[PDB]
Amino acid sequence: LEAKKSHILAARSVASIIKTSLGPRGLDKILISPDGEITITNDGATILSQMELDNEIAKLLVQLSKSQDDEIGDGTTGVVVLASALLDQALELIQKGIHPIKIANGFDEAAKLAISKLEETCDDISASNDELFRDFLLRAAKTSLGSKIVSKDHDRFAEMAVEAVINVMDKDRKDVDFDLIKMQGRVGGSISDSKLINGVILDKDCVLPKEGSDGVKLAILQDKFKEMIDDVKKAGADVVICQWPAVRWVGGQELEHIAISTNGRIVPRFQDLSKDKLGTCSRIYEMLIIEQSKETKTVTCFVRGSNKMIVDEAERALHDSLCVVRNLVKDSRVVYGGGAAEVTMSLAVSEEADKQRGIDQYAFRGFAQALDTIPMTLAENSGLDPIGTLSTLKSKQLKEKISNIGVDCLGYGSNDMKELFVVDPFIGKKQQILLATQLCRMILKIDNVIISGK
């Protein structure tokens, strides 16, 4: 028991590093890369993943946040805080003489009660028309996803990214495409210079459209130079990209987005050039801008910025919105978080403890206390007293039937999340609670750490 006691104290020190980064208001910390480069970003998943500690207990939390980054990507701080809160309560219950599995069995039973309670609070945003539905997707990134400064009004470059996944996904409200949705950055100008077009813009190297063809006749591929032109004149292609108009030193993977959007193919050798691979591109003009006015699922957001971290942090916020919008479109269950569901689910578990009593009463209390650590952490990050914040939320949810009252970090006034348009994925909060408890059961099973000889 003495070995795991130092591991819990070491795990709490890791949670205290990102403790100030929890929530959209959460403040980051300066991280120094081993190569000497400084990394400043407000994303909690980026700093925690790049940070490497000594003790193996901290490395176990890295693998937990590694799956959260590839799935959720935003708000991964609450995963470690909830996991550390279960270990903080383990210093008491385990010391009382109760086996960890007996405490772990109460967490899995209380998790099903939280999921069932969270399902009753789901609000379907697809019940309205397409005008209000597409407006909620843009307003979803207006508040919850906003973190860094200057994001106060981000809708200039955000609406281009929000409407990007809307045109790709069908109106049946079920689609997933991870292939054709990517972010392409550029160093220069300002963030306000971004544009929304259908195509891809590369860093390597105009003609009027025709009648029958869609224009520019895009074909993806001194005597020998003119001989290949005669083969192009057979298909009449105005612009041809020659890998092995002409280009110099272009990559094969970079030309994949052009062949898929234009329904073209890669030509291994000039002898294999044929008309069946001729594509359609609306306009090509100069850095050439490739645009397509037809129906396609290929959309790339061209982003500019004065620094690398400005473009990188902006893309990670917009790229993680793909899983957010998919949970707001493909998933019909939408819940309001940010202190609303966290405190609501904690009150349902607290009432279950007094019903069963026995050894599960203290076990269910630890799960409800673990969920109460998120609003107490957001209270300190917002400058509010943790005791006074939770006392106000619980008083209103018991007297009033509205479950959308939650913590106000940025001073939005009224605490109703429905009026503030603060939305969190339903599957997001489900995976964060289960995978956190999944690791906490393995932490309590740690006996002796074996390390290979140096």
Binding site: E56, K59, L60, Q63, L64, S67, D70, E71, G97, I98, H99, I101, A104, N105, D108, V176, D177, F178, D179, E256, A259, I260, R265, I266, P268, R269, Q271, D272, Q431, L435, Q438, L439, M442, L444, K445, I446, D447, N448, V449, I450, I451, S452, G453
Partner: protein
């Protein structure tokens, strides 16, 4: 004297596994030079990555590696017995008692122990529990005796249905291999009736791949397809593609990857192809679809092309894998693990592979006895009465082995937080005036009958446990000196 110094170094082996005994046991964390995190209860993976100093530590490793063939599970309650026999034998080795009397007396105790274990094992057959019952009701807690406590209820309604398709006298362990799929849930795992493998490589037509086949045909080809010289290299590859179409194969498995010429020819005709096929996956198809591997196009013939019921393209975890269903000959059911944590996938990987060993020995003989460490208590109770009249000094020798089996109930109380003395007093009356079958119950936290508890364990585990601990403990006593050069 030299053996005592060797035992003390080997005592810490099972003392690190001390809490791991029982379903309440803990796990051991191991970090190698590659920073590969391995968390598992099974000591086989623990002893494999454990740094050894004295050669006696390798003795327990060789028995643990051979434990998979003899039993395969319950390694926490077996290997620990090898160190306990030598722990209480220290006062006897210091006296004039030779280690030969300990080794000779051990075989006399095991000969009496196995005789009682076979007596405890009872086969009724007749109208009592049959297939789909013994593998479910009695195997509920028998399959996983250590881990998967919360998810046990999920696998009883799932994993039991997968091993039901395995007929007796076959017992093929090549087709039970699993895969690692990131993301998902444990109880949501889909059952697979055919060969399924990862793509491992991304295609430009990945989204354009054919969804399903009505009558697919799988063909394995090792021919490498890659591109006056330009016309010659392009024509030779084109002629090889036409000879494959003559066989009418909708699925072509290539060992080496293919270029764009072979991909475009197969895409226009809606012919499926998969590259980077491992050699282990090819033998899995031979035992399922029944095809053959052709090195070149000289000997390829239409009768070498196999077929299966239907083909389906499954998308799970934001990645698509090949799925075969309705193979002509399938002796098992392929299972695909899920979940976002890599340690959990490897945690249940060792547990599910240990559960098939019970189905293997159950089909040969169906037998169950009282579990929960109550097997050694009844055997130790009988050895106390017999050893008094057996060959002089062997009374105190067997009684030492009788008290050595008492470590099992002491370990079950250590994790549960019970008293080691309180359980011995209650079992002593339960294994004497209470006949036999009364065991220990962890749920109600008292002593009860394992017959009404529904928890049983195969007696074949305890039979090979003494045999695995026979040459392990005898080798320690038979070696009086250890020499290490340089």
């Amino acid at each position: 004297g030299q053996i005592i110094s060797n035992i003390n170094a080997c005592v810490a082996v099972q003392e690190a596994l001390k809490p791991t005994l029982g379903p309440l046991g803990s796990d051991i964390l191991i970090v190698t030079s590659n920073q590969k995190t391995t968390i598992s209860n099974d000591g086989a993976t623990i002893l494999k990555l454990l740094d050894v100093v004295h050669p006696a530590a390798k003795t327990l490793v060789d028995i643990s590696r051979a434990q998979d063939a003899e039993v395969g599970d319950g390694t926490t309650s077996v290997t620990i017995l090898a160190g306990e026999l030598m722990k209480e034998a220290k006062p006897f080795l210091e006296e004039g008692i030779s280690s030969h009397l300990i080794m000779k007396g051990y075989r006399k105790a095991v000969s009496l122990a196995v005789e009682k274990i076979n007596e405890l094992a009872v086969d009724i057959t007749s109208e009592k529990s049959s297939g789909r019952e013994l593998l479910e009701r009695c195997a509920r807690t028998a399959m996983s005796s250590k881990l998967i406590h919360n998810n046990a209820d999920f696998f009883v309604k799932m994993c039991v249905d997968a091993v039901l398709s395995l007929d007796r006298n076959d017992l093929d362990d090549k087709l039970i291999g699993i895969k690692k799929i990131p993301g998902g849930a444990m109880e949501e795992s889909l059952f697979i009736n055919g060969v399924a493998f990862k793509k491992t490589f991304s295609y430009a037509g990945f989204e354009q791949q054919p969804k399903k086949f009505n009558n697919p045909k799988i063909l394995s080809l090792n021919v490498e397809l890659e591109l006056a010289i330009v016309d010659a290299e392009w024509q030779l590859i084109f002629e090889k593609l036409r000879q494959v179409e003559e066989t009418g194969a909708n699925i072509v498995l290539s060992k080496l990857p293919i270029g764009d010429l072979a991909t475009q020819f197969f895409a226009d005709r809606n012919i499926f192809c998969a590259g980077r096929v491992s050699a282990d996956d090819m033998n899995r198809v031979i035992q399922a679809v029944g095809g053959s591997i052709q090195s070149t196009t000289s000997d390829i013939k239409p009768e070498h092309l196999g077929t299966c019921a239907l083909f389906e393209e499954m998308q799970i975890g934001s990645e698509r894998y090949n799925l075969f269903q309705g193979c002509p000959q399938a002796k098992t059911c392929t299972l695909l693990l899920r979940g976002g944590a890599e340690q959990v996938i490897a945690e249940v990987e060792r547990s599910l592979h240990d559960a098939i060993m019970i189905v293997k020995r159950a089909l040969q003989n169906k037998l169950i006895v009282a579990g929960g460490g109550a097997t050694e208590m009844e055997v130790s109770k009988c050895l106390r009465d017999y050893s008094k009249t057996i060959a002089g000094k062997q009374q105190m020798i067997i009684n030492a082995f009788a008290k050595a089996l008492e470590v099992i109930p002491r370990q079950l109380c250590e994790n549960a937080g019970f008293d080691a003395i309180e359980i011995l007093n209650k079992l002593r009356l339960a294994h004497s005036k209470g006949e036999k079958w009364y065991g220990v119950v962890f749920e109600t936290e008292n002593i009860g009958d394992n017959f009404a508890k529904f928890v049983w364990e195969p007696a074949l585990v305890k039979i090979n446990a003494l045999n695995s601990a026979t040459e392990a403990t005898n080798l320690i006593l038979s070696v009086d000196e250890t020499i290490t050069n340089k």
